[PDB]
Every structure is written in structure tokens, then in C-alpha cells.
């Protein structure tokens, strides 16, 4: 897959993903993307719905496809492991839940991205993730559980 991270004085603190037709970047981090083609794009700020601008042309566009409707609570893949939850996000164990893991995409079995994480460091024995998704008819919403620190 293609998910370029965000640099700030050498250390890694953010991740930027590429979807079909657009690029994404979380607002809780500051830094410059190391890709030169991904640095001259006018990334415009937005609300919690996280609107960015995919001004890059077609010839590298659509590395991955956003998820369609009919979302089960079944298996979903993750960079550190797996998640099986649709209404909320799964109680993944420790290790994941550090710092700088914002923007890492959550994908299905067929390589299609479902959600993009933004928070939820550690909520005890059960760890929740504050992600964005499409609720019922493709309208992009933001879900945040209680006490979700920016992660």
C-alpha cells in the first residue's frame, strides 16, 4: 500500500493516506510531508469531517478505494493487527496506542479502506479508537468515544 508519513525535525508523528481521488491528513499534527509531489498541494483546513484537497493528477491516483455500503461487524485489517467492529472500534490490546499513529488507515479483507484513526490512546483494558467513517448512506461522520485523547 501507499501511506506516506509526516516528518517534523526527523521524528515521525503523523501519517497521510491516499484514497481514490483525494489525499488525507489529520489536523492534530504539524509537519511537512517528505514527498515533494505531496508537499506542493494546497491542503485546505476544515472541520471534524476532515476535508482535504487531492490536487495531484491521475497517474498515481487511487492507490486504494474507500469502503462501500453494507458494513458487517466482521473482520477488518489493521497495520498492527485486526479489528472486528462496526458501530464502535475494537478493544485492541496494548502496543498499539502509542504516539504518532494518527492517520493510519483501517482496511477490510479486500484491501478497501474503511476508517482513519485520530485518537483513543488508552481506555483501560478495552482500548477504543476515535475514527471517521460513513454512517448509513455515504455521509462522512466522525465518531469519538468518551475521553478520547488526540493520538
Amino acid at each position: 500500500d501507499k501511506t506516506f508519513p509526516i516528518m517534523l525535525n526527523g521524528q515521525v508523528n503523523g501519517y497521510a493516506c491516499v484514497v481514490g481521488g483525494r489525499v488525507f491528513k489529520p489536523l492534530h499534527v504539524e509537519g511537512r510531508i517528505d514527498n515533494e509531489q505531496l508537499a506542493a498541494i494546497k491542503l485546505k483546513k476544515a472541520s471534524i469531517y476532515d476535508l482535504e484537497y487531492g490536487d495531484v493528477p491521475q497517474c498515481m491516483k487511487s492507490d486504494t478505494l474507500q469502503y462501500t455500503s453494507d458494513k458487517p461487524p466482521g473482520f477488518y485489517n489493521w497495520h498492527h493487527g485486526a479489528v472486528q467492529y462496526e458501530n464502535n472500534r475494537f478493544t485492541v490490546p496494548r502496543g498499539v496506542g502509542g504516539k504518532g499513529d494518527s492517520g493510519r488507515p483501517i482496511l477490510d479483507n479486500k484491501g478497501r479502506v474503511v476508517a482513519i484513526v485520530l485518537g483513543g490512546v488508552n481506555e483501560g483494558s478495552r482500548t477504543a479508537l476515535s475514527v471517521v467513517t460513513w454512517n448509513q448512506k455515504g455521509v462522512t461522520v466522525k465518531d469519538t468515544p468518551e475521553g478520547s485523547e488526540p493520538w
Binding site: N135, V139, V141, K142, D143
Partner: protein
């Protein structure tokens, strides 16, 4: 003068109708914006659930 001047002695009919048009026009533009500002907060609160 036999009479006495007041504040509203000089205001004619068309002068009073002109300022109440401009009072009502700018107050209508504000409540048009204020209606639409709280409408989209309801549909943003309804897309989540």
C-alpha cells in the same frame, strides 16, 4: 411661533417608510443567516445518529 417643535415633527410619510424598510431589511438578512446557521447544526447532529 405659537406652536412647539418636537423630534418627529419633520418626518413625512415617505421618510418614515424609507427608514423602516432599511431597518427591516438588515434585520431580515441577519435572521436569514441565523436560521441557516442552526439548521445545518441539526443535520450535522443527525448524520452521526
Amino acid at each position: 411661533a405659537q406652536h412647539t417643535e418636537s423630534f418627529t415633527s419633520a418626518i413625512s410619510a415617505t421618510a418614515w417608510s424609507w427608514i423602516k424598510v432599511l431597518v427591516g431589511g438588515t434585520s431580515a438578512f441577519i435572521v436569514l443567516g441565523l436560521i441557516a446557521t442552526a439548521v445545518v447544526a441539526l443535520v450535522l447532529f443527525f448524520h452521526r445518529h
